[PDB]
Design an enzyme around this catalytic site. Structure first.
Site, mmCIF file in Angstrom:
data_model
loop_
_atom_site.group_PDB
_atom_site.id
_atom_site.type_symbol
_atom_site.label_atom_id
_atom_site.label_comp_id
_atom_site.label_asym_id
_atom_site.label_seq_id
_atom_site.Cartn_x
_atom_site.Cartn_y
_atom_site.Cartn_z
ATOM 1 N N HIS B 41 0.756 -1.150 0.024
ATOM 2 C CA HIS B 41 0.005 0.202 -0.041
ATOM 3 C C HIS B 41 0.891 1.389 -0.091
ATOM 4 O O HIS B 41 0.363 2.394 0.181
ATOM 5 C CB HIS B 41 -1.122 0.076 1.038
ATOM 6 C CG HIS B 41 -0.468 0.250 2.558
ATOM 7 N ND1 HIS B 41 -0.546 -0.777 3.436
ATOM 8 C CD2 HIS B 41 -0.094 1.395 2.859
ATOM 9 C CE1 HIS B 41 -0.248 -0.083 4.576
ATOM 10 N NE2 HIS B 41 0.133 1.170 4.533
ATOM 11 N N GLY B 143 2.407 6.248 9.445
ATOM 12 C CA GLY B 143 3.900 5.991 9.203
ATOM 13 C C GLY B 143 4.643 5.081 9.887
ATOM 14 O O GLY B 143 5.542 4.543 9.442
ATOM 15 N N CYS B 145 3.550 1.913 9.379
ATOM 16 C CA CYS B 145 3.478 0.641 8.484
ATOM 17 C C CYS B 145 4.853 0.271 7.705
ATOM 18 O O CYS B 145 6.055 1.139 7.723
ATOM 19 C CB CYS B 145 2.646 0.976 7.457
ATOM 20 S SG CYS B 145 0.729 1.552 7.781
#
Ligand SMILES: CS(=O)(=O)NCCN1CCCc2ccc(S(N)(=O)=O)cc21
Ligand SMILES: CS(=O)(=O)NCCN1CCCc2ccc(S(N)(=O)=O)cc21
Lengths: 304, 304
Positions: B41, B143, B145
């Protein structure tokens, strides 16, 4: 979102851990620049620990008796000195992995990460608080001595603690990196009383703010209180008295949530007086006091 | 003695954290050998996340659009591929800090350490469990991820988790390092149901053994039970059914303490039915399930 008891990343401290052996005793040492720091009780035998005369014991030791091993390489000891309850072993090589560092003496109620080590090897990391009675509730087995506590600000590691002993009560005692014990403790195998411990009130309030930020708001009430009225209740439940300095440090959290500090105190007063009624706050069935207002801000904003 | 929610030392994983930017999105990547692993993503914009067609989105991206930065040096991307929900960015340089590592898919109930990162920088480390419903209760902000979960066995890092998302319920979902989600979750900004979560029974029993080892023994009783009778109670309180495999894994703890597994189950049954009556076990007012029997053994014996 979510709120965890987070420790600092331990990498900068892992590169400083060494094994220190003197006679038959082995513990952990901290290698910063060309100095290895370790508990002075590394020079004691089982007979000595009951009433050690460290000055006399250290006199029978020469540089060649201190065996310092970093990973698999042996360090050459060129000097030895005792500073309070720590030994400083001057080595001929500066640690190439020495991070930017400071030695700091933390205040009671402040938090730090502990890198538990055995034989100079890191086994785990956890966050804890220096209790108001200057003890820590850690996880330390035989060989863990010399494991250190620290805080990290960007690239600077502030070492604040070195583990020395477990009291008969199972709580832990140690020193700052200048070898000064936190609390009244001595490095002697004798029964030692830790003071009456109290709950760190400002940290509980900081954690209630962390709960509101994450959605746990059931404990918020229609009440308010005064510093004096709150402190009457805090005294009854063995909580540290809240000062205006504590209120000021909670300022950013009060500003972010829009809940006045004294309103948060009224919620805490009601929780102290009524309990949690079987409920939880941030997955905890008790009032958590090992998160400072700075920890809450850092975690709730992602400070790296 | 003492018992803490200990995480693994994070040093070996810190040296693998990189920042990955694609368009306007920045998250964390894991640099092992000459490959950077990150959530797919990273290629989505805010419009895309609602119903992304990852195959079509990735086709508009070339190697030069993936900006991978390790600390302060830029990595040159020479290949890009999608494997399930992760992107694998082939870089021209092997990470000099790549530890010995494995990719493993953990089972529900198992524990791991998470190195929460932002912009490729580590901020903190904590221990958690993969819930029986395949979610984790972490601490992840925007942030985070690409932050990873791992276990460490001597010198080998077994990466088990990569953070991808927070569900509307505030719980966290992610994948193994091959990009396969744990649970039914999809990397789509849509309401997703996590299953009914249950308490990891074997971990609670392991933690009761850890309590006995450390002196908290008030909950021990004069009773015993059967696997069938215990499971009737476990079902009523939404505990995972105890199997003979779980009893076998508790074997070393049962041997060390001299308390039969079924006797420990009877104590747990009484705690489930009566509560803690305002008492605590290992400084906790609830039944802890994020310590596996292996965690208890390792911590209680000082495995480095
Ligand atoms: C754990 S051991 O076999 O007693 N080794 C010596 C530890 N030992 C050195 C460091 C100072 C110290 C202080 C208290 C105590 S205790 N827990 O009260 O006996 C032991 C102690
Ligand atoms: C946090 S954000 O501003 O929505 N960024 C996109 C995150 N975003 C990408 C990853 C997949 C995913 C899944 C669920 C959800 S949510 N919490 O239900 O909206 C967001 C999501």
């Amino acid at each position: 979102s979510g709120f965890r008891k987070m420790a600092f990343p331990s990498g900068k401290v892992e590169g400083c851990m060494v094994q220190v052996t003197c006679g038959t005793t082995t513990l952990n040492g901290l290698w910063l620049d060309d100095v290895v720091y370790c508990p002075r009780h590394v020079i004691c035998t089982s007979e000595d620990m009951l009433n050690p005369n460290y000055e006399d014991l250290l006199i029978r030791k020469s540089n060649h008796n201190f065996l310092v091993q970093a990973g698999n390489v042996q360090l050459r000891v060129i000097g030895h000195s005792m500073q309070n309850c720590v030994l400083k072993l001057k080595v001929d090589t500066a640690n190439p992995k020495t991070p930017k560092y400071k030695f700091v003496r933390i205040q009671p109620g402040q938090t730090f990460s502990v890198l538990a080590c055995y034989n100079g090897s890191p086994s785990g990391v956890y966050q804890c608080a220096m209790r108001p009675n200057f003890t820590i509730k850690g996880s330390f087995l035989n060989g863990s001595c010399g494991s250190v506590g620290f805080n990290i600000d960007y690239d600077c590691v502030s070492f604040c603690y070195m583990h020395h002993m477990e009291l008969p009560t199972g709580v832990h005692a140690g020193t700052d990196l200048e070898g000064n014990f936190y609390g009244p403790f001595v490095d002697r195998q004798t029964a030692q009383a830790a003071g009456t411990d109290t709950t760190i009130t400002v940290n509980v309030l900081a954690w209630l703010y962390a709960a509101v930020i994450n959605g746990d708001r059931w404990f918020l009430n229609r009440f308010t209180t005064t510093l004096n009225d709150f402190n009457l209740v805090a005294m009854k439940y063995n909580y540290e008295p809240l000062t205006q300095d504590h209120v000021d440090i909670l300022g950013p959290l009060s500003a972010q949530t829009g809940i006045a500090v004294l309103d948060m105190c009224a919620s805490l007063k009601e929780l102290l007086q009524n309990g949690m009624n079987g409920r939880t706050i941030l997955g905890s069935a008790l009032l958590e006091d090992e998160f400072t207002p700075f920890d809450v801000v850092r975690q709730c904003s992602g400070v790296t």
